[PDB]
Amino acid sequence: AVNGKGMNPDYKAYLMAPLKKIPEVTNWETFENDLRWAKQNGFYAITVDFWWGDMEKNGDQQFDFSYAQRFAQSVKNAGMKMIPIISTHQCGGNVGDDCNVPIPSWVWNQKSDDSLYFKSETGTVNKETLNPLASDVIRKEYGELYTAFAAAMKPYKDVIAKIYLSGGPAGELRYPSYTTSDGTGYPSRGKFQAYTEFAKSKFRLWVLNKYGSLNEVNKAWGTKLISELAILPPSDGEQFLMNGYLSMYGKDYLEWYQGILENHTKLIGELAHNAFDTTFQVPIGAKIAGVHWQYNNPTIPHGAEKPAGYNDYSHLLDAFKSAKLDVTFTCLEMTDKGSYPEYSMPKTLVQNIATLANEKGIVLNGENALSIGNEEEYKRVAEMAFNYNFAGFTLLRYQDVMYNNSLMGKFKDLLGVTPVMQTIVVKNVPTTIGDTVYITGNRAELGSWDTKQYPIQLYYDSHSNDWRGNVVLPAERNIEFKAFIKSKDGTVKSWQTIQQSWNPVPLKTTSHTSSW
Ligand SMILES: OC[C@H]1O[C@H](OCC[C@H]2CO2)[C@H](O)[C@@H](O)[C@@H]1O
Ligand SMILES: [Ca+2]
Fold first, then answer.
1. Whether the CB of 199 sits within 6 Å of ligand 1
2. Counting runs of H as helices and runs of E as strands, what totals does the chain give?
3. Any binding-site annotation on 383?
4. Is 397 annotated as a binding residue?
């Protein structure tokens, strides 16, 4: 893996449950049989959406966690673990949504103004989830729902491996910038969602707070606004994405726009930790969506990411670190294209986030964007997950592998692996001052024969006078590897004469010793 290290020793695989309730797509007895089968194929836990529209449907504080408890019982029965998703977003309307579960309708009656929902540049109204701007409503409702959920799941703390929060649309921390209704679906540029009167007032007050008065605002922006009511969001999104974003106004608006998401992260994170920490003591995470289209467009740079609220990823990840939330990213299965008309750079994005996350010491997890029906895609996920230090990978979705032993088998082989610590030893390596030794092998875990950025470095044992390293390998998998010397200048000097193998890698720690 990058920086000469191996796969993450804490790696685990998870499986996404159906979008609809179990008894609607199968039955409990069979669900349990499926879970034992999934477990058999390397899956550690099942992630499941617990819809807000289901849990607090009829009215404020009129909870119904019965389904969630019943689900948890079958998980305990099947001898598995779960990762619930407190889905404070609507099911239905997103790519691949076979369901229809809106958030509670009484919630909208809580406000007189338009603070709760979103409105695009063209006036399209979105109500899939609550507008992060309405922090007061969010603090009350989420605080209440998280606390109530914790109490109801307390009896099953033993089968809960982690908890995911919903930061917005489709359970991801973003703005609903890409929707068919708004004419902003893939691969089109996105639209800014700050056009409610509430959003306008907030930006305006945020600006005047930063500068004090309009006279200072104009000085900073080099503008000539006559009144304060002239402080508004981008009148032309495309034009803003073309050049507006470069001005002081542009820099400021984008700061506020993304900032709303950073604050939201800090808020739901504090509510979640207060609610779940003492009773469960498990990791809490949130997701960032993979908006890969319009990434390398020359005219509108990142024309899909910006409207979604992703302007500065590094600053955005700092918010997760502060909120003490683990982060999940998508699109691990795809590769870069970066060509007209889409300008899709999936693989580059992932690598960027992964770098930042690992730099910041943030636990990283990944998921696939679309249903995988080919092992070639599994191989792509493998390269990313085992080289970019992902702590876990979640497969979307249940029915894909559950009713196809072929995919299920390829998944077990490639991604449903168990990391084990093993000692690699190489004897009599002709090293000179400046020579560093590495190993590379056939599997994604060993860098897939790459010697440039994925090899695993070995270290010299002064006492044993040889080169060795504690490498994390996939337990019970056949591997082929070879050690090589890399010179001071960074180029391969020579290779180990004979190709080594471990068929298979032991389930218990030990060592593999070979000579140059
Ligand atoms: O089942 C998990 C999630 O799966 C989908 O998201 C697409 C994949 C990413 C954007 O989680 C659904 O649209 C979400 O509502 C759901 O929370
Ligand atoms: Ca409530």
1. no
2. 14, 18
3. no
4. yes
Residues in Cβ contact with 389 at an 8 Å cutoff, skipping those fewer than 6 apart: 1, 2, 5, 7, 8, 354, 358, 364
Distance CA 34, CA 180 (A): 35
- Phi, psi of 378, rounded to the nearest 5 degrees: -60, -40
Q: What's the gap in Å between 128 CA and the centre of ligand 1?
A: 13
- Alpha-carbon 324 to chain mean position: 15
Cα torsion through 172, 174, 179, 181, rounded to 10: 110
**Method by which this entry was solved:** X-ray
Which atom of ligand 1 sits closest to the CA of residue 89? 15
Q: In terms of DSSP H, where are the helices of 41-118?
A: 52-55, 66-78
User: What distance, in Å, lies between the first and last C-alpha atoms of the chain?
Assistant: 22
- Domain span at residue 311 reads 1-416
In DSSP terms, which residues pair with 484 in a beta bridge? 438, 495
Which CATH number characterizes residue 498's domain?
2.60.40.10
Atom index in ligand 1 nearest the CA of residue 87 equals: 17
Say whether 330 counts as a known binding-site residue: yes
CB 32 within 8 A of CB 77: yes
Same domain, 201 and 226: yes
Question: Among all ligands shown, which has an atom nearest to the Cα of 107?
Answer: 2
Pocket test for ligand 1, best of 46, 87, 97, 332 (most atoms within 8 A of CB): 97
Side chain identity at residue 321, one-letter code: K
Total domains in the chain come to: 2
Are residues 133 and 205 both part of a single domain?
A: yes
424 and 434 in a single domain? The answer is yes
49 annotated to a ligand binding site:
yes
Amino acid at 340: Y
| Contact by Cβ (8 Å): 167, 86 | no
Please tell me whether residues 394 and 421 are part of one structural domain. Answer: no
Q: How many angstroms is it from 387 CA to the middle of ligand 1?
A: 25
The atom of ligand 1 lying closest to the CA of 94 is 13
> Is there a single domain that holds both residue 384 and residue 426?
no
Is the domain of 485 the same as that of 473?
A: yes
Query: Which value in Å is the resolution of this experimental model?
Result: 2.1
Domain limit, last residue, from 351, 386, 416: 416
What three-state secondary structure class fits 476?
Answer: coil
Token representation of residue 420: 């084990």
Same domain, 387 and 449: no
Same domain, 360 and 491: no
Q: How far, in Å, CA of 309 to CA of 493, rounded?
A: 47
Distance CA 227, CA 224 (A): 9
For the question of residue 172 being annotated catalytic, the response is yes
Task: Measure 22 CA to ligand 2 centroid, in angstroms.
Answer: 26
